[PDB]
């Protein structure tokens, strides 16, 4: 299933869309996890909120001005924490002549403009806002309450809001503890994504180590600082397999364990995201290479190994667990579909 490891798009019916965890097992049975990123288009009848016309006075406690330094496909992004602003003030800045999306025909024209201007006119990203835009009664794919195996930890299971503007970006990274992630684009302009399949993740890390040797000597997982931007042209020049996709409003993006992703916002928008787990993540959690310099998001794997791997719990707590992770295998929950 999915030998090419290309990004897959799913269109579930209302019946299929009801159980979130069973649907993740279904897209895995179809090999969507091989790409590292999958798109889920929900049924037209499904809506997480009736109106977004009441969030003008919602506070963005720490907007970040993104300063990008670099040349010829390789860039470093630096954040400047600005003081608290409202969605109203942010939308006014996002839509102004200084920060607005340039005029474009197709995505490729906008993508070229992005890679050519990302170091000029630093944009502001309304990133990591603690909160949700889902209404109380919404039981399907409610990012603020997914009901996955990650809940046995209890701030990794909490939703975050991302208010974008043109040219705001997210650097090459995997999820904390190499977890899964769900991203819902509530409204606004698209969000473009790049992904490297989990089976090629080490090729990207080796490439990144070669470009930033000082950053690699100072940190075992320097890509976890989320500061490294690498263009598709640079990835193509050094033979890194990758795929790209554009997420539009009302669509979900799913990231899979050890699936490296990056991207940018086309203009003013709002995305809600959280992390989640399946039985397959457990092995990735145990084997995760964490940021050594900063003291970073770390989950104690003991509770997970004792509940879902009881037979191997003593061998692992000894330090003799030599399990090699096969990235192509779907989650055990996918058995019913196979």
Ligand X SMILES: O=c1[nH]cnc2c(-n3cc(CCN4CCC(c5cccc(C(F)(F)F)c5)CC4)cn3)nccc12
39 binds, among ligand X, Cl ion, Zn ion, none (CB under 5 to 8 A by kind): none
The nearest distance, CB 273 to ligand X, in angstroms, is: 6
The nearest distance, CB 162 to Cl ion, in angstroms, is: 14
Residues that bind Cl ion (CB under 5 A): 52
Instruction: State yes or no: is 175 an active-site residue.
Output: yes
- 């999915």: which residue's tokens? 2
176 binds, among ligand X, Zn ion, Cl ion, none (CB under 5 to 8 A by kind): ligand X
Residues that bind Zn ion (CB under 5 A): 219, 291, 293-294
Instruction: State yes or no: is 162 an active-site residue.
Output: yes
Q: Count the neighbouring beta carbons within 10 Å of the beta carbon of residue 154.
A: 8
The nearest distance, CB 55 to Cl ion, in angstroms, is: 6
Instruction: State yes or no: is 200 an active-site residue.
Output: no
Question: How far is the C-alpha of 274 from the C-alpha of 143, rounded, in Å?
Answer: 6
Per-residue interface string for the shown chain with ligand X, residues 111-150, x marking contact by CB under 6 A: ----------------xx----------------------
Instruction: State yes or no: is 261 an active-site residue.
Output: yes
Say which of 51, 106, 108, 155 is annotated catalytic. 155
Nearest CB to ligand X, comparing residues 128 and 199: 128
- CA distances 176 to 19, 251, 282, 300, 324, Å, are 25, 23, 13, 13, 20
* Gyration radius (Cα) of the chain, Å: 20
Q: Give the H or E element holding residue 85.
A: strand 85-86
Nearest to 252 by CA among 87, 70, 63, 41: 41
Distance in angstroms between the alpha carbons of the first and the last residue of the chain: 11
Instruction: Answer yes or no whether residue 321 interacts with ligand X by CB under 6 A.
Output: no
Dihedral of the alpha carbons of 205, 242, 259, 123, in degrees to the nearest 10: 90
Q: Count the neighbouring beta carbons within 10 Å of the beta carbon of residue 220.
A: 12
- Mark 189-201 as b/e (b = at least 16 C-beta within 10 Å): bbbbbbbbbbbbb
Say which of 23, 31, 164, 175 is annotated catalytic. 175
Among 163, 170, 172, 268, binds ligand X (CB under 6 A): 170
Does 270 count as an annotated binding residue? no
Question: How far is the C-alpha of 222 from the C-alpha of 225, rounded, in Å?
Answer: 6
- 């996918």: which residue's tokens? 334
The nearest distance, CB 224 to Zn ion, in angstroms, is: 6
Nearest CB to Zn ion, comparing residues 30 and 275: 275
Residues with catalytic annotation? Answer: 155, 162, 173, 175, 261, 273
Known binding-site residues equal 125, 173, 175, 183, 191, 219, 225-226, 261, 291, 293
Residue list, annotated binding site for 2-oxoglutarate = 125, 183, 191, 226
């Amino acid at each position: 299933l999915n030998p090419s490891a290309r990004i897959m798009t799913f269109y579930p019916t209302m019946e299929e869309f009801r159980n979130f965890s069973r649907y993740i097992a279904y897209i895995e049975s179809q090999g969507a996890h091989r790409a590292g990123l999958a798109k889920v288009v929900p049924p037209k009848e499904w809506k997480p909120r009736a109106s977004y016309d009441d969030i003008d006075d919602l506070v963005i406690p720490a907007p970040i001005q993104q300063l990008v330094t670099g040349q010829s496909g390789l860039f470093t992004q630096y954040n400047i924490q600005k003081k608290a602003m409202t969605v109203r003030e942010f939308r006014k800045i996002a839509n102004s002549d200084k920060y607005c999306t340039p005029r474009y025909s197709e995505f490729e024209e906008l993508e070229r403009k992005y890679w050519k201007n990302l170091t000029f006119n630093p944009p502001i990203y309304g990133a990591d806002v603690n909160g949700t835009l889902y209404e109380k009664h919404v039981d399907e794919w409610n990012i603020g309450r997914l009901r996955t195996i990650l809940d046995l930890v209890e701030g990794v299971n909490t939703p975050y809001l991302y208010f974008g503007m043109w040219k705001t970006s997210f650097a090459w990274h995997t999820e904390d503890m190499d977890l899964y992630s769900i991203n819902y684009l509530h409204f606004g302009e698209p969000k473009s994504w790049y992904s490297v399949p989990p089976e090629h993740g080490k090729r990207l890390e080796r490439l990144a180590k070669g470009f930033f040797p000082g950053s690699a000597q100072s940190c075992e997982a320097f890509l976890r600082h989320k500061m490294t931007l690498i263009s598709p042209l640079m990835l193509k020049k050094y033979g890194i397999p990758f795929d790209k996709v554009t997420q539009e409003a009302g669509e979900f993006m799913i990231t899979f364990p050890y699936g490296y992703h990056a991207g940018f916002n086309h203009g003013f928008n709002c995305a809600e995201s959280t992390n989640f787990a399946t039985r397959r993540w457990i092995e990735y959690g145990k084997q995760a290479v964490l940021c050594s310099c900063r003291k970073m998001v770390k989950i104690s794997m003991d509770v997970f190994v004792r509940k879902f791997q009881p037979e191997r719990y003593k061998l692992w707590k000894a330090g003799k667990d030599n399990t090699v992770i096969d990235h192509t295998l779907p989650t055990p929950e996918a058995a019913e579909f196979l």
